[PDB]
Amino acid sequence: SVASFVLLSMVGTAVGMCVCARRRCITPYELTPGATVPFLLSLLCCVRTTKA
Amino acid sequence: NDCIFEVKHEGKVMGYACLVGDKVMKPAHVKGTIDNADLAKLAFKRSSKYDLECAQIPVHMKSDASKFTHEKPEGYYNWHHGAVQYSGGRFTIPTGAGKPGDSGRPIFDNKGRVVAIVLGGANEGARTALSVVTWNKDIVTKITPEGAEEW
């Protein structure tokens, strides 16, 4: 049971790294004045990529 | 109301918030609430690292927004309290024009295009070199000289 526990904490840390990665998708491109980065979003494609 | 946009908290100006391009911008360090209830209900994103608050501008207000440019030639620019000298990679102001509370003022050129937002300033006697947050080739960058005070 604690092995299932530690594996689900490994999935929890996967969730934590993914949510930190989505927050560090957002912090370079909040909605910069330029509001157009194909060179960012055309390579990253993490989440909600469609805003230029 | 030419360029003036403002967040106010319990009667006192807590700096200013500005909608610029497609963003609603507010310094994160300014505590309190936007003094327009229609604005106050949008989804706001906070960044402590850069002290930035951003929101998506609603469509029906888009036509009041300022034009922008990433390109900042050396010269003189405009802000709320007058001329702003830019040269040497250095933005400067006359000492006393800015104080805690003035964070959020836009800097705009002779065509009224905003190029930077004031974050604070470092008094060096006769002149004050301002600490600033700005953007260049779509990347946000904060420039802080040593010994700068938050406004």
Add this chain to the structure above:
Amino acid sequence: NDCIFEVKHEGKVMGYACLVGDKVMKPAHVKGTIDNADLAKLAFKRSSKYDLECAQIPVHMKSDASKFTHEKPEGYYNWHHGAVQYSGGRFTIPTGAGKPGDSGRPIFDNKGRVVAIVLGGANEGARTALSVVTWNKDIVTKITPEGAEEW
């Protein structure tokens, strides 16, 4: 007859079609018939993504064709109802200059080269930002402001 050709449908005016280069362009959402019977019978190609219907210009309509360019500098331009601002990657008009029915009018520069056709618009208060399809470096691309409705 300067740049605009009437489309009419069952007695009511139903937008516009344009002769540009060797191409016939028509918004796909526009129902009805082009007011030239030879034109109405050509093989039309549909693009749903761009809302475009296209046809081959016949040889005999040499004198109605426009001239075009892919190059669109920032500034002000002209259309039938007045000035059209291009800035920030955005076309805008005085609110009320455009209405449902105006879909199909071309946008042209100061040298009369058609650069764009109007597909619709989003009211943003003082001005209205147009949803348009246009060719950047000869490739068709749609530029759409948020929340745009067909006109």
Add this chain to the structure above:
Amino acid sequence: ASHTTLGVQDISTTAMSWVQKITGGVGLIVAVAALILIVVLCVSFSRH
């Protein structure tokens, strides 16, 4: 019995291969998130 000397570090059949195959950890994804964090810090973190 006479073989009683056994504990918890007891080798077996396929079992330890099974616990090897189950241990496909997350440290690669953690490392690429650390890479993104590093490339965000090093835009202006040349001093401290």
